Symmetry: C3
Subunit: 136 residues, 3 copies
């Protein structure tokens, strides 16, 4: 039957093209998937590398946090000691000033004694001289 | 031949649908690939941004590690100096205490001298008085 | 028409296979897309986790940078104070050395006074003895 054959020929030509369309899209799709896969692989390496770098920094930061706290405590000790030394130097200055006063007072006394010893000696000698001359 | 035509019609209708199936899957697949591509693009920007942020932190951490070590050495110098000042203040206190002792000893001596000078003067004057009165 | 039927049968068998090819590729592609999607999902969680970890470290680093600067200023204050205490201890030593000199000078004077007082007393007593014996 000619009419049936005719219809069938058109259908087959349609199907040929539709299969072709599908096959072509599936080939393009195959390429897009391989590209995305490639990109994901590079991402995987980058993400793993960022993990490693984070761990590295974290460890360094840990050491620094410890070092800061340690330094802070040591500075505080230093500051307390310096404050103690300031007090002790102040007290030493006070005592030094006192000694300066003490020494000056003493210097005045011993100078007065030196003076008086010599004055008294001359008065005694002069008085012995008169009595000696009077006896003779 | 009618029997051949009949078989052929069924085959064509089968093929039509199978092509259609393929085309439909390939269209869905095309959409999934575009979505994954979109996601990968956003991932790319995020990963690049994390790289930059890591570099930034790394540089800051570098400066802090240096600052910790520097501060640690400077504290150590401070502590050694403070320990030296403690010794020197201790020695000064020792010498101050000695001077306090020295001054007191001296204060006692010069006071005894002052006393004796005056006592000896009175004894001399009283003795001159007797001899003077005896001569007359 | 037999020749038309014959050609048509070959075409249908070709189309059957081409549709099949397409369908098979589209099924493989469907699987590759699901796998890439799965990988992207894991990447998403990793990238989000790296964001969080970066923020965490950044905050710690911030605190350390502050702690370094603070410690640096406090050390500097300590160092200036220690330098001041060194000067003050030096001056105290100078004054102490002066006092040592002052005390020794004074010790020599008061010892000479003690000596002279006693010498002068003996000379006076001996001279009174002669005059007394002469009067009688
Ligand atoms: Cl067909
Ligand atoms: Cl004296
Ligand atoms: Cl520090
Ligand atoms: Cl310090
Ligand atoms: Cl100090
Ligand atoms: Cl596909
Ligand atoms: Cl994909
Ligand atoms: Cl840090």
């Amino acid at each position: 039957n000619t009419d049936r054959i005719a219809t069938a020929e058109l259908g087959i030509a349609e199907n040929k093209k539709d299969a072709q369309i599908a096959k072509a899209q599936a080939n393009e799709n195959k390429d897009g998937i391989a590209k995305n896969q490639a990109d994901i692989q590079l991402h995987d390496k980058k993400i793993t590398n960022l993990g490693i770098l984070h761990s590295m920094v974290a460890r360094a930061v840990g050491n620094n946090t410890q070092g800061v706290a340690t330094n802070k405590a040591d500075i505080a000790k230093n500051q307390a000691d310096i404050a103690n030394n300031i007090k002790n130097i102040y007290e030493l200055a006070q005592q030094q000033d006192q000694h300066s006063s003490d020494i000056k007072t003493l210097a005045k006394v011993s100078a007065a004694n030196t003076d008086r010893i010599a004055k008294n000696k001359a008065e005694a000698d002069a008085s012995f001289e008169t009595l000696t001359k009077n006896q003779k």
